[PDB]
Structure 1
Amino acid sequence: TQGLPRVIELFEARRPKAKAVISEIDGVVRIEEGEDRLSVFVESEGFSKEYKLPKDARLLVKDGDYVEAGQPLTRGAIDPHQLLEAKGPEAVERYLVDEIQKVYRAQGVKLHDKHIEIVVRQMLKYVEVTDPGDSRLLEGQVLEKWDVEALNERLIAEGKVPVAWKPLLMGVTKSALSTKSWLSAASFQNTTHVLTEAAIAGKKDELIGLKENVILGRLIPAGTGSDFVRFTQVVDQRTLKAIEEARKE
């Protein structure tokens, strides 16, 4: 597939048509049989993992070749969820960006990677718990807010459980969906679920993002509405010394 459909496929972390098999394990390649049935083995010392192909499939490892942890066997597109678990979160990030660009580039478009990066990182915002310290053992949690517990219960109040987690490739939509602040969350496909829930828990916003404050009619937390700049006062020569002569009174 090409064009915009690809860019969505990508930005949405979507397990495509012609997943074109990757080897789960390292090892040595062995193509076997033609026309009748086509299968490929990547068997190292110990394990012998077998990858049955369509037969029509245009595989791109010839017999004998040595192979890599998550290396493509077959051609086609690659599942970004299969890549996550086989070969980590960075390798994922690096696939997404470089593939998304593979199209804008291929066409005519020139844009900087950082944009795509900024977005891609958000696809990696959350992680699911395995064996917790405080909360229930299954919940999805923001990568940072788990460090708010991991490197918290292993320093000052050290002990209990560091909270083990798993890397969690969220598609662009899904990730947008699971977004802390209820105000923002409300604007998506089912506003009731949000509010119902957020009402039960004394949930609070804090209104960090923008989608939030525009909803309220508040002054956007960016540009001139950035905490880092909007408090800036300007005092004016004679105003300053005259303001100084009523301070020691």
Structure 2
Amino acid sequence: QGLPRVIELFEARRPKAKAVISEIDGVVRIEETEEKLSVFVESEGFSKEYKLPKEARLLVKDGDYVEAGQPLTRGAIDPHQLLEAKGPEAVERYLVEEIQKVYRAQGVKLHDKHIEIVVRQMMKYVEVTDPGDSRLLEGQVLEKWDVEALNERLIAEGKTPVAWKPLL
């Protein structure tokens, strides 16, 4: 839970005790009983519905803001699911924070910059979602996709921007 937790953070491994993940936003609205919690948020055209084992705490009744990647089963948040839940920007702010929390706990204190470099390095590759020159589902660096759009647009007429997907 000290060094190992740090590892789970840097290795982006599936958290020890997972705590599910919220998808979309709207008014927090969740059901009550039944083995499968019949959650029902709202928003535009969507809704909610989840499923997990028995032992679970929520911390949030019906009414307020649910958002994406909020406290659900309250515990260790999956950074992977959170990537598709809240985006690239959020994860970088999450990981650094909890990693730093671990080190804070045992008194030894280092600057956030250092951790921020490693976590930025964990966020360099992005998986293709729309092929134009290369194949889809291909693991590729974000900055290598910079020159794609940039050059094909400002220099070329090739209006086929390859859509990439954030990959943690």
Offset at 1:160? 4.2
User: Which has the greater radius of gyration?
Assistant: 1
Offset at 1:14? 1.4
Structure-2 separation of matches of 1:36 and 1:161: 48
Of 136-145 and 27-36, more deviation after overlay is shown by 27-36
Q: Percent same amino acid at aligned positions? A: 96
Deviations 1:126-168 (A, max 9, x none): 1112223322233221111121222011111232422221111
Deviations 1:167-206 (A, max 9, x none): 110xxxxxxxxxxxxxxxxxxxxxxxxxxxxxxxxxxxxx
Please tell me whether the aligned partners of residues 32 and 40 of structure 1 are also in contact (alpha carbons under 8 angstroms).
yes
Please tell me whether the aligned partners of residues 21 and 78 of structure 2 are also in contact (alpha carbons under 8 angstroms).
no
**CA RMSD of the aligned region, Å?**
2.1
Match of 1:236 in 2: none
Q: Quick one: structure 1 residues 51 and 115, their matched pair in 2 at CA, closer, same or farther if it must change by over 3 Å? A: same
Under a length normalisation based on structure 2, what TM-score does the superposition of the two structures give? 0.88
Offset at 1:119? 0.4
Please tell me whether the aligned partners of residues 31 and 63 of structure 1 are also in contact (alpha carbons under 8 angstroms).
yes
Please tell me whether the aligned partners of residues 149 and 162 of structure 2 are also in contact (alpha carbons under 8 angstroms).
yes
Deviations 1:37-70 (A, max 9, x none): 6554323353221123433212211233331122
Q: Quick one: structure 1 residues 55 and 42, their matched pair in 2 at CA, closer, same or farther if it must change by over 3 Å? A: farther
Structure-2 separation of matches of 1:50 and 1:101: 33
Please tell me whether the aligned partners of residues 36 and 50 of structure 2 are also in contact (alpha carbons under 8 angstroms).
no
Q: Quick one: structure 1 residues 164 and 62, their matched pair in 2 at CA, closer, same or farther if it must change by over 3 Å? A: same
Offset at 1:74? 2.1
Q: Secondary structure at the match of 1:152?
A: helix
Q: Extract unaligned runs of 5+ from structure 2.
A: none
Offset at 1:15? 1.6
Q: Quick one: structure 1 residues 54 and 139, their matched pair in 2 at CA, closer, same or farther if it must change by over 3 Å? A: closer
Structure-2 separation of matches of 1:138 and 1:53: 30
Greater share of strand: 1
Please tell me whether the aligned partners of residues 40 and 53 of structure 1 are also in contact (alpha carbons under 8 angstroms).
no
Structure-2 separation of matches of 1:135 and 1:37: 43
Structure-1 separation of matches of 2:86 and 2:31: 27
Deviations 1:23-44 (A, max 9, x none): 2111223343358765543233
Offset at 1:21? 2.4
Under a length normalisation based on structure 1, what TM-score does the superposition of the two structures give? 0.61
Offset at 1:104? 0.3
Q: Secondary structure at the match of 1:90?
A: helix
Structure-1 separation of matches of 2:154 and 2:102: 46
Structure-2 separation of matches of 1:53 and 1:138: 30
Structure-1 separation of matches of 2:82 and 2:89: 10
